[PDB]
Amino acid sequence: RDAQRMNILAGRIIAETVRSTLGPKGMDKMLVDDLGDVVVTNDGVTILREMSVEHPAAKMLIEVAKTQEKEVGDGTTTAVVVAGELLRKAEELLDQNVHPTIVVKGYQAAAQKAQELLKTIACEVGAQDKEILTKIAMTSITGKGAEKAKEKLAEIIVEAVSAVVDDEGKVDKDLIKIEKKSGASIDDTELIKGVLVDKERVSAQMPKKVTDAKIALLNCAIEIKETETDAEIRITDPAKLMEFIEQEEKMLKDMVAEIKASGANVLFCQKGIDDLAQHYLAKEGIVAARRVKKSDMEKLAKATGANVITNIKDLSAQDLGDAGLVEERKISGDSMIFVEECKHPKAVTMLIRGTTEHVIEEVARAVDDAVGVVGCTIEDGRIVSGGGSTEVELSMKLREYAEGISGREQLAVRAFADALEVIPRTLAENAGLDAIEILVKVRAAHASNGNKCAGLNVFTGAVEDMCENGVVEPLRVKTQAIQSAAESTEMLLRIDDVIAAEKLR
Numbered sequence: 001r002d003a004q005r006m007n008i009l010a011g012r013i014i015a016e017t018v019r020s021t022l023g024p025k026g027m028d029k030m031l032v033d034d035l036g037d038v039v040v041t042n043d044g045v046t047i048l049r050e051m052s053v054e055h056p057a058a059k060m061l062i063e064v065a066k067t068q069e070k071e072v073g074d075g076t077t078t079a080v081v082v083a084g085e086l087l088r089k090a091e092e093l094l095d096q097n098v099h100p101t102i103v104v105k106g107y108q109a110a111a112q113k114a115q116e117l118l119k120t121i122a123c124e125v126g127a128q129d130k131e132i133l134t135k136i137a138m139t140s141i142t143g144k145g146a147e148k149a150k151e152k153l154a155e156i157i158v159e160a161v162s163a164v165v166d167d168e169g170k171v172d173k174d175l176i177k178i179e180k181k182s183g184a185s186i187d188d189t190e191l192i193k194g195v196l197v198d199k200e201r202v203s204a205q206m207p208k209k210v211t212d213a214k215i216a217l218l219n220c221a222i223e224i225k226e227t228e229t230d231a232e233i234r235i236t237d238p239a240k241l242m243e244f245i246e247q248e249e250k251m252l253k254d255m256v257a258e259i260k261a262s263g264a265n266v267l268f269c270q271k272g273i274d275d276l277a278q279h280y281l282a283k284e285g286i287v288a289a290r291r292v293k294k295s296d297m298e299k300l301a302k303a304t305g306a307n308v309i310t311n312i313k314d315l316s317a318q319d320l321g322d323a324g325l326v327e328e329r330k331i332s333g334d335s336m337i338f339v340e341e342c343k344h345p346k347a348v349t350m351l352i353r354g355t356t357e358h359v360i361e362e363v364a365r366a367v368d369d370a371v372g373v374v375g376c377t378i379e380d381g382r383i384v385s386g387g388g389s390t391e392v393e394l395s396m397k398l399r400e401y402a403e404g405i406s407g408r409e410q411l412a413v414r415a416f417a418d419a420l421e422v423i424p425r426t427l428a429e430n431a432g433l434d435a436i437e438i439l440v441k442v443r444a445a446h447a448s449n450g451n452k453c454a455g456l457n458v459f460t461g462a463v464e465d466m467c468e469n470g471v472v473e474p475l476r477v478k479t480q481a482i483q484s485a486a487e488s489t490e491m492l493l494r495i496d497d498v499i500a501a502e503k504l505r
Helices: 004-017 059-069 078-097 100-121 134-143 151-164 240-253 257-259 277-285 294-304 357-380 389-404 409-418 423-429 439-445 476-494
Strands: 029-034 038-040 176-180 190-192 209-210 325-327 338-340 349-354 382-385 472-474
Touching: 004 059, 004 078, 004 476, 038 357, 059 078, 059 423, 059 476, 078 100, 078 409, 078 423, 078 476, 100 151, 100 389, 100 409, 100 476, 134 151, 134 472, 151 176, 151 190, 151 338, 151 349, 151 357, 176 357, 240 257, 240 277, 357 382, 357 472, 357 476, 382 389, 389 409, 389 439, 423 439, 472 476
Parallel strands: 176 349
Antiparallel strands: 029 038, 190 349, 209 325, 325 338, 382 472
């Protein structure tokens, strides 16, 4: 066998695994491992990331989807479906004694023409409109499947990303923290100005609320410190069975006196604290938290401007952090610390609620991907008509450019246009509508004089203007998906030799 013929089949099987999961409605898959854990979700890269690959060329497909997640986020599933059709059409075309080299030139040249043609189909919008951004987030969260309480979540996510808009245009995603916790309903979700630390209090005797506090970090143990340089502990008392115990209490009761002298107040230690030491700290009233993740100490210092210090002895004033209002109230579940950074706010958090942990995990990924979808829109400022209305137009206009081309390469350009027409068919197959009878209806509605926004709605189930429904999305998801699809195929169609060379580092 020509070997290369087998590499094409290894890519189609990966596309069929995530083909019947696009659009608002669609049956989701279920993962299972040898351990026993089970998790279900509709996201794209979340599923392919867990699949166990085997063939070497199979990794080239998931590689494209991985790079698309770090850039924008949503739209990784469609990138694999469009690429699958390019391989199926190439099989029938290649079978006709067509060399695989001239076929690459067709997709490469055709992809460049569609890139500039789609730029003119888009429409410019404002860079901070409170009405256009609300409709963009609706199509993103709706794609993951959550028709229960989404109209309110759209206005909340758009209000948080607005504060991240810098003074130049760039948008950052690290300033948007996500928090998941059970509660009672999805409507309980709110936007917190400060951060949120989900931890318990070590002593209930400590103050419940204090104003005008002072942040103080400590990513290291808090107890007696040993000599750094080569030395030995100094102790020669007769009753040494109690001296070391009092020494620890002194380090937790005396050192704190010097820390507060520099304006400090509350503390946030990393490891635990001595048992007897908590007794004195309880009466003194010093907030603290034992056993905290290292990732938590980084977001606070980066947002508040503090410095992560390890030596409890070297704690000057500049090493601390300003505050405004600290409190560890409770609401629907266990208490949680709410540190408000009103002096220099930059990052925010979103506390998600729900009836069961298995439900909040689904919407947790939708809100995360929405930041990239809406974030890039504020940076560029140009959206397009979603719902397959923008892709169906290229399939009809690209044929005009193929007429000018001559030779065998012209046949490859026509196949690219038909292959691109794949998102409107599968979108209706999973819904329930026909897969052919409706295609001719949309083609006639948008033949020439028709508007450039007609598509298909799975809800009503009839052709109509999709722009009026409010289903839109930024062009950053399509311009990058089509650009990567035309280049990814070049790696599989060109490769042919498979040498079993061992030891390659």
